[PDB]
Design an enzyme around this catalytic site. Structure first.
Site, PDB file in Angstrom:
ATOM      1  N   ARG A 161       7.880 -17.133 -23.518  1.00 43.65           N
ATOM      2  CA  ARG A 161       7.054 -18.136 -22.855  1.00 43.65           C
ATOM      3  C   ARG A 161       7.490 -18.570 -21.463  1.00 43.65           C
ATOM      4  NH1 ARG A 161       6.222 -17.794 -27.938  1.00 43.65           N
ATOM      5  NH2 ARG A 161       8.479 -17.310 -27.781  1.00 43.65           N
ATOM      6  N   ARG A 185      17.622 -20.002 -16.829  1.00 40.69           N
ATOM      7  CA  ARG A 185      17.845 -20.235 -18.235  1.00 40.69           C
ATOM      8  C   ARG A 185      19.279 -19.841 -18.459  1.00 40.69           C
ATOM      9  NH1 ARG A 185      14.246 -18.930 -23.486  1.00 40.69           N
ATOM     10  NH2 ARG A 185      13.310 -20.792 -22.517  1.00 40.69           N
ATOM     11  N   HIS A 234      15.521 -29.188 -22.236  1.00 42.52           N
ATOM     12  CA  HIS A 234      14.459 -28.251 -21.895  1.00 42.52           C
ATOM     13  C   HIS A 234      13.266 -29.048 -21.346  1.00 42.52           C
ATOM     14  CE1 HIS A 234      12.179 -24.572 -21.715  1.00 42.52           C
ATOM     15  NE2 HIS A 234      12.148 -24.256 -22.987  1.00 42.52           N
ATOM     16  N   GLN A 292       9.451 -27.754 -21.043  1.00 44.27           N
ATOM     17  CA  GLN A 292       8.745 -27.658 -22.310  1.00 44.27           C
ATOM     18  C   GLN A 292       7.994 -28.964 -22.592  1.00 44.27           C
ATOM     19  OE1 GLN A 292       8.459 -24.965 -24.758  1.00 44.27           O
ATOM     20  NE2 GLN A 292       6.785 -26.389 -25.195  1.00 44.27           N
ATOM     21  N   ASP A 350      11.232 -27.402 -34.353  1.00 43.07           N
ATOM     22  CA  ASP A 350      11.709 -26.187 -33.710  1.00 43.07           C
ATOM     23  C   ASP A 350      12.684 -25.555 -34.682  1.00 43.07           C
ATOM     24  OD1 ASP A 350      12.593 -24.231 -31.660  1.00 43.07           O
ATOM     25  OD2 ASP A 350      13.895 -25.696 -30.739  1.00 43.07           O
ATOM     26  N   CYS A 377       7.691 -25.743 -29.880  1.00 42.13           N
ATOM     27  CA  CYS A 377       7.922 -25.066 -28.604  1.00 42.13           C
ATOM     28  C   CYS A 377       7.874 -23.545 -28.617  1.00 42.13           C
ATOM     29  CB  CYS A 377       9.270 -25.480 -28.034  1.00 42.13           C
ATOM     30  SG  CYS A 377      10.697 -24.968 -29.013  1.00 42.13           S
ATOM     31  N   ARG A 403       2.580 -24.208 -20.767  1.00 43.38           N
ATOM     32  CA  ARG A 403       3.846 -23.889 -20.122  1.00 43.38           C
ATOM     33  C   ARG A 403       3.586 -23.305 -18.741  1.00 43.38           C
ATOM     34  NH1 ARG A 403       8.528 -23.062 -22.633  1.00 43.38           N
ATOM     35  NH2 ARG A 403       9.024 -23.001 -20.382  1.00 43.38           N
TER      36      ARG A 403
END
Lengths: 320, 320, 320
Positions: free
Chosen positions: A58, A107, A134, A137, A229, A269, A296
């Site tokens: 994503r 990331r 994050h 998100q 998650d 997510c 996103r």
């Protein structure tokens, strides 16, 4: 609101008004491009360094297609291809990236690496997920919720899962939108004590409630949004069993939803495993998972445009 | 012909007229861009997800430079970088790709994975080669042949090699252009019985001949086009010897050409090893191998434009 | 000067006037885009094949963001993703690249691979570093020096380090700009005898001095520019110790600078390790390392534009 040139490492550095501006711009870009079919070369003649230390579907796609859709060039960089470990000091790669790209999305594992990168680079550094936060998100999540409910203030978010980066980002932002938070994590898997303390402070400043518990059904009670998650995710570490044992009872099911508010919806997510949520909830008409994943893209486009240009949204501000 | 929004997993789903349209558009795009030097931003503001599970030089380059040459952004995705195995269910990656890209080209092992991807995604899925078919290769091949011979109808194609994805794609399409097929494979290395049955049907409907044999010289006799591909290719599996033993005698040489029609030419999808064809034929003036490889680009550009836009070819329809 | 269609494998094939033209174009592109903020789509409708056999941060980024900044599409290709070893003959990949891309930048081990690629491809092949030369690095270096000193003629370059690709490139070019060279390497780690011979010839033709020595301080004496690169770099080969023992005393420090000309500056192609230079020199106000790294971008943009278009610089020619 003045966001041009800023980094976006965490939402804790951003006020309610600033995060609301990014969601307004997201909505603006989405209406103009997805609905009116306009071509908006706002990032023309710009480039992005996209450093990825971990897998991504994503964040990778949304950032790459989104940067390009505004006429800029995204550059996908991995540990395997560039000098980044014992290969080159991060101070030096940060200065090199500064003279070659206009911004960096990274990331990483360590949030400390994003901090070094932000201190050493003279260009915007955007968090593409770290172990601690994050933020981009939660931008998509809140936009997806505003689109569903037509506003945000007063909604109660119900986290069930690990006290991870997604929960810390919600903690850094929910109260600023006047939304309450009820979060369930196993004992020993609580959110970071530093983050919780700041969340308690934000709740007090905004007149919202914060509840931390170890009971899934307590977190879910009266909640408008069920959020989870991957918890099990010990990767593949033999001794694990404990992230299964400690987290037994944390699967989101219709039993969980039965306790939630009547207008409940569900977020995740992604990527999703069977353990955190069953198929009935995950593929429920009330599941906003794939709208969330799509947002996103419009939200990372708005991040990039607000940190790099002086574009003003033409859209009417959304009701938050 | 109406192809916008369709998937292209195999040529069996496409009529003679539909495949002829794609070759017309290929020729149109090639004349306009390669010869008139025009810039045609037909895929501007579009993106492509290019999932690659195996190595690629031609499909990779043709799709990437071709998508970009029309103003769209190609996004190179591998198993190593995105979530795709035990990492995320294909149904979910298919829906995520649908909201972020405009189409997907995927080189996979299992044709079943392309089917899941096509059922679950609401955007065009194009086959980048699977174990069962390689349709976009045959598009380039037939365009290269039309350019060489100034037509296609009545040509006899002579396959010598394994009963693989390239032969199945020829089987799914040759008769629709009124071309005959003579194919040699070793015993036990025959084309799929299901594909052969449908090829027999297409031959009957179009009044063309289909011949399956184990003799290279029988396949080559009276053929206008000699076609082969890597057979030995057991990769590197020690016990192999048998793909060498069963395939001994399948090397295309000038002995093979001596039996072919006077105007014979040679094709090979590439990459090429010494075993399937010798250097005399491979680098013969009659070898159309590198024109063929180039036409991978103009044909994948035409695929993309026909599945995503409403562009009409300005060129006169080629004689087929 | 006529450079369109040429390869750039090494600066030895280029006259003083030709290399001066590339630095003029670099300066022109930099002034127009970085300073006037113009968008110059000079490479619109073009693509680049970027073959990388080794890691890269600077060459990767400068080539990718630079090709894209001029409106062209860069295509990042690795050994892992395309057919290149025992996978496909280089003659064939060279012809395939020729019909799909407009030029190739390739970072290889063997200079012989660049030669095969240049002979077999009908499109420009640019060296992205090989074991023998790194020409596009010296382009950035000399531009950075011209910007610092406002001219180049008469400067003395002081190499201290291994007799590697960077030193060979300086050797192939320094005298053509009327600059002297003093180079220190350990015994047994001298520049290639063939290159030294040609450097001696260029020095004679241009009236400049060439000095080869094993003493760092002899190389540094009266030098305007101190230049080094990673020597230790045995990678990680246990038996090494000798690239440490033979190179002990080659660290550039302020002791080294004390012996240099009063206006001394420092260059390093990067990535940098602690062994070749200490932090005091590396982060000195006299260190031009990060300006140098930035100029990798404007110079590879000028290379690409001069080898692929008929663009003339609008800028006044820089004083060399």
């Amino acid at each position: 609101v003045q966001l041009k040139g800023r980094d976006l490492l965490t939402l804790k550095n951003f006020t309610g008004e600033e995060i609301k501006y990014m969601l307004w711009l997201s909505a603006d870009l989405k209406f103009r491009i997805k609905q009116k079919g306009e071509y908006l070369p706002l990032l023309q003649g710009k480039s992005l360094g996209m450093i990825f230390e971990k897998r991504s579907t994503r964040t990778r796609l949304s950032t790459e297609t989104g940067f390009a859709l505004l006429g800029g060039h995204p550059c996908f960089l991995t540990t395997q291809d560039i000098h980044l470990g014992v290969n080159e000091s991060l101070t030096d790669t940060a200065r090199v990236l500064s003279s070659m790209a206009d911004a960096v999305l990274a990331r990483v594992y360590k949030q400390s690496d994003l901090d070094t990168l932000a201190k050493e680079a003279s260009i915007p550094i955007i968090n593409g997920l770290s172990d601690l936060y994050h933020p981009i998100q939660i931008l998509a999540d809140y936009l997806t919720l505003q689109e569903h409910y037509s506003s945000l203030k007063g909604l109660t978010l119900s986290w069930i899962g690990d006290g991870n980066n997604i929960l810390h980002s919600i903690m850094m932002s929910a109260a600023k939108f006047g939304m309450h938070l009820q979060a369930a994590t196993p004992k020993g898997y609580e959110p970071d004590a530093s983050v919780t303390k700041l969340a308690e402070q934000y709740a007090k400043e905004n007149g919202t409630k914060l509840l931390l518990t170890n009971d899934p059904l307590e977190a879910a009670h009266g909640g408008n949004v069920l959020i989870t998650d991957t918890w099990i995710s010990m990767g593949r570490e033999e001794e694990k069993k404990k992230r299964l044992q400690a987290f037994q009872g944390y699967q989101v099911t219709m039993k969980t939803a039965k306790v939630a508010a009547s207008d409940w919806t569900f977020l995740h997510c992604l990527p999703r495993k069977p353990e955190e949520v069953d198929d009935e909830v995950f593929y429920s008409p009330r599941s906003l998972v794939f709208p969330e994943a799509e947002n996103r893209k419009w939200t990372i486009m708005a991040v990039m445009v607000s940190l790099l240009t002086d574009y003003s949204p033409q859209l009417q501000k959304p009701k938050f």
